[model samples]
Target: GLRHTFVVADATLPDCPLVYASEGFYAMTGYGPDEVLGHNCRFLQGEGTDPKEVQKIRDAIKKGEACSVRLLNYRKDGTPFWNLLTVTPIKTPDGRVSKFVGVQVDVTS
Candidate 1:
């Protein structure tokens, strides 16, 4: 029950807006569907987030099929947490990327 947070974003959509999110995501991020869906996931990134880590995320999303990254992410209350996020590209029958799944785990102690 603790690791149920999942977010599936549209890979083909402009800016990769989130299309689906599990209930655990709400509990973890304190963001409802109204504040999440149809928008870029910039709210999770604050000044503490590392640009190098962000580049790793970008590179994997662009070329590879998946990537696992641990970075500092901000919550709704502006509190920081260590987020171990895994992004996997969901492809179609034609091998074209249709969507992607992003699961997050808070590694904060």
Candidate 2:
């Protein structure tokens, strides 16, 4: 099976809200489609999450670059886990970024 996958609109807002999230994402995050849709992935970040690591992802998104980072993330139940996240920019035919694709893998043992 594939890892959790999600898509976010490349909007000008502070939070790039999710446009789509696969069933794998639901399984990993413990959030139903209704709960997760239109919410930023940052909702998964919590007190234990590293700000520096999140900044790396934020910088990459701002530049439309691909990035991978390992950081702490929380499930809907507030349980903490290590997350390996990968994000890539998706561009339109004119080379303008239209969306971002993200994959999440739980690395906690």
Candidate 3:
């Protein structure tokens, strides 16, 4: 079953709201769609989760670029896990950015 769900946005846009999420996302993050709307995903990273790589990707995306990287992330309980994250930029007909799409696939083993 799908554990997580989210939308992709244009690199120039700020943190876009999650257009979708799965039960597992709520179970893991203790956050429902309502509470997560319009918030940056940095909330998912806790003390143990490293944001260095995550920040790098965000910076790249801000410049209307796409990139993928792996980083340590944490659950609501502060449990650490590896996340294979991808950020893609969505643009309009005029080539203006609209939103940013971000996906988090759990790779913890």
Q: Top model by TM-score, which number?
A: 1
Candidate 3 wrong stretches, greater than 4 Å: 1-4, 8-19
Candidate 2 residues 1-109, lDDT tens each?
6445555654545567887887878888888989888888888899988889999998998888999999898889999888899898888788877788887888886
TM-score of 3: 0.75
TM per model? 0.92, 0.88, 0.75
- List model 3 lDDT by residue over 39-108, tens digit each: 6667777676556786788687668777788877777667787777787877789997677677777777
Global Cα lDDT for candidate 2: 0.82
Error of 1 at 12 (Å): 1.7
Better of 1 and 3 by TM-score: 1
TM-score of 2: 0.88
TM-score of 1: 0.92
Worst 10-residue lDDT window, candidate 2: 2-11
lDDT of 1 by residue, 44-84 (tens): 99998989988998888787469998889887898888899
10 residues in a row with least lDDT, candidate 3: 4-13
Query: Which residue ranges in model 1 land beyond 4 Å of their true spot?
Result: none
Question: Which structure among the candidates has the greatest lDDT?
Answer: 1
